Paper text:
CmnC is an α-ketoglutarate (α-KG)-dependent non-heme iron oxygenase involved in the formation of the l-capreomycidine (l-Cap) moiety in capreomycin (CMN) biosynthesis. CmnC and its homologues, VioC in viomycin (VIO) biosynthesis and OrfP in streptothricin (STT) biosynthesis, catalyze hydroxylation of l-Arg to form β-hydroxy l-Arg (CmnC and VioC) or β,γ-dihydroxy l-Arg (OrfP). The overall structure of CmnC shares similar folds with canonical non-heme iron oxygenases. The catalytic iron is bound by the 2-His-1-Glu facial triad comprised of His148, Glu150, and His295.
In this study, we solved the crystal structure of CmnC. Five high-resolution crystal structures of CmnC in free form (CmnCapo) and in complex with l-Arg (CmnC l−Arg), l-hArg (CmnC l-hArg), α-KG (CmnCα-kg), and l-Arg/α-KG (CmnC l−Arg,α-kg) were solved at resolutions of 1.49–1.83 Å. An asymmetric unit of either the apo form or the complex forms of CmnC contains two polypeptide chains in a dimer form, which is consistent with the analysis of size-exclusion chromatography. The electron density is uninterrupted and traceable from the first residue at the N-terminus all of the way to the end of the C-terminus for both apo and complex forms, with the region between His205 and Ser216 lacking significant density in one polypeptide chain of the CmnC dimer. The structure of CmnCapo was then used as the phase model for determining the CmnC complex structures. The superposition of CmnCapo and the complex structures, CmnC l−Arg, CmnC l-hArg, CmnCα-kg and CmnC l−Arg,α-kg, shows relatively small root-mean-square deviations (rmsds) of 0.105–0.168 Å for Cα atoms, suggesting that CmnC does not undergo a significant conformational change upon binding of l-Arg, l-hArg, and α-kg. However, a flaplike domain (Pro201–Ser233) adopts two structural modes within two polypeptide chains from the CmnC dimer, implicating that CmnC may undergo conformational change while the reaction proceeds.
Author numbering:
A (entry chain A): 0 to 338
B (entry chain B): -12 to 205, 216 to 338
């Protein structure tokens, strides 16, 4: 589909209008995931520029979308200061405005959520290279490619959209994206991928090693259960003309003894691995990946660890907050796995 | 004629009814937006309008949008009620004798306004088997269906249910826009208060121990509808968090699984509880309600239809929080009619 990537470039006035709204939110509320802000966010998002809201709404109802990309938001690089050396230190005063703006864009597409087992249950999370994580399989990697995956592929509560706000990307490091064309794998493999014949385990970002050590063991009980005893699940679901995709290149296996399923997974990985294409998010570019339609990753790069490194804000968006209520502490709570 | 909003409790449900009263300026703003939409778009459920509806809805009065957004995230809501929209009774003309004659030029502006309010809560959908797959449907009494089990009834109690209880694609909200209601006829509403029911009965209702069949009201889709009557799936009546369970039950079309006497018991306990807990919502002309179909059953009590063009008349809509999830049951990405293909 020619419109699989939908791009809006902000005019200077539209950029200024989005920046002023984000700064008004920063003046009113403490954190971009403060409960009072999140309660108000869907209505505050309505004050974003009309031309932007029109294009976001076209993207939201496009069931073949790969990504909506909003180019040219204002980022004051001098005021932002250095790229933090760890996500734990990335909730900086100077970066609050970008957190608020990411939530406002996201709230046009649905309701923002976080995970108890990712970056200590923060709703606005940070993607930046960490010294000693170069060769890890998590978003803080650099030297090793971030393997392509559906975000939280293991979970029935996985996001409908993943939002990425690029604060800085001096070496133009590419995000990687792929969808599945059913006609190009054959109806034989599509039939197999629709079967509950696969195990999808949680990725390494959900491990205690990528959260603060003081976090309750019991936050991880659900993750540990999903690693040890994965449910038999499909990779494709929904309409044959527009199937949803759910797979993680590093954490998906066929069920033991299902040679036909193992073959279809092998075929899918080769198809997606090759079709995987690049989107570069420059400073002030915001992307929303349709997590029902595409896998994503990130190209390998060399981090300088001098405060100049690539830095994205990330958010998960659900079309239907109500459906995850069994996994949330209370009605307004946005952190999946607190129940 | 000032703006006001508040929480109206029913039993232990402290936010059961979220009520909004429009100011005269808010009513005029909403009316002007609906009239502008009626000038620029073919139909309140045409593809051109529905592609834009969620953005146009952002032009409704801000104070109303804040209160609607609070209702949308209230997982214990029964009914959001917005009172005081403009209805020009003289210009509207008589209540049509049948829904087939009810998509009138004079009533278009009210269909547009219902869709604008609905689009603050989610995406509007219809059903291939209901009023020719119209998204904006019509509720009015039909002569010769006084004693019918459907929304065109009058003399007989419309028996209460979750809307489309049998279906995994059932609406999150049912919307009603009252055009006229001279005898103050009510919608009946009930939710479960788990503090009034034995915990053991609640545990049974969470079990996949029930059959919910379609009404006779209701092809890969229609193959599923025949199977739904003949070989119904074992489903639960309650689902989700114990602190905020969703309800799905039909007083006339729900049974326990063959041989499950305990489930038969729990079901009849629930039917007696909801029957006893029914309360009424009356919508005057220009009053709009959204029932949270995840939380409440609804019905209607007997009333006296004259069939002289003065009868009660509402516009009705179904809203889903997640349009994408029903794509297997819709014709194409933008089509809103469940079971169309």
């Amino acid at each position: 589909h020619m419109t699989a990537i939908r791009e809006i470039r902000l005019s200077e006035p539209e950029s200024a209008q989005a920046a002023l709204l984000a700064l008004e939110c920063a003046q009113r509320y403490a954190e971009p995931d403060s409960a009072d802000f999140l309660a108000d966010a869907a209505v505050l998002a309505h004050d974003l520029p009309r031309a932007v809201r029109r294009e976001v709404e076209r993207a939201r109802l496009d069931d073949r979308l790969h990504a909506l990309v909003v180019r040219g938001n204002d980022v004051d690089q001098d005021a932002l200061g250095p790229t933090p050396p760890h996500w734990r230190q990335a909730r900086t005063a100077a970066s609050r405005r970008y957190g608020f703006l990411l939530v406002l864009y996201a709230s046009l597409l649905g309701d923002v959520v976080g995970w108890a087992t990712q970056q200590d249950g923060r709703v606005v999370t940070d993607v930046l290279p960490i010294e000693g994580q170069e060769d890890s399989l998590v978003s803080s990697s650099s030297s090793v490619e971030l393997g392509w995956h559906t975000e939280d592929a293991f979970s029935p509560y996985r996001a409908d959209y993943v939002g990425l706000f690029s604060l800085r990307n001096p070496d133009s490091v590419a995000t990687t994206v792929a969808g599945l064309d059913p006609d190009l794998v054959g109806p034989a493999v599509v039939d197999v991928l629709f079967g509950e014949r696969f195990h999808i385990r949680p990725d390494n970002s959900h491990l205690p090693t990528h959260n603060s050590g003081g976090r309750l063991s019991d936050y991880f009980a659900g993750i540990v259960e999903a690693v040890e005893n994965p449910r038999a699940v499909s990779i494709l679901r929904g309409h044959r003309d527009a199937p949803q995709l759910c797979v993680d290149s590093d954490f998906t296996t066929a069920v033991d003894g299902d040679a036909e399923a193992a073959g279809a997974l092998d075929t899918l990985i080769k198809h997606l691995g090759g079709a995987l294409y690049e989107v570069v998010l420059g400073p002030g570019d915001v992307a929303f990946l349709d997590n029902r339609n595409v896998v994503h990753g990130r190209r390998p790069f060399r981090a300088r660890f001098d405060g100049t490194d690539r830095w994205l804000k990330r958010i998960n968006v659900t079309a239907d907050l109500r459906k995850s209520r069994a996994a949330r502490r209370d009605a307004q709570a946005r952190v999946l796995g607190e129940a």
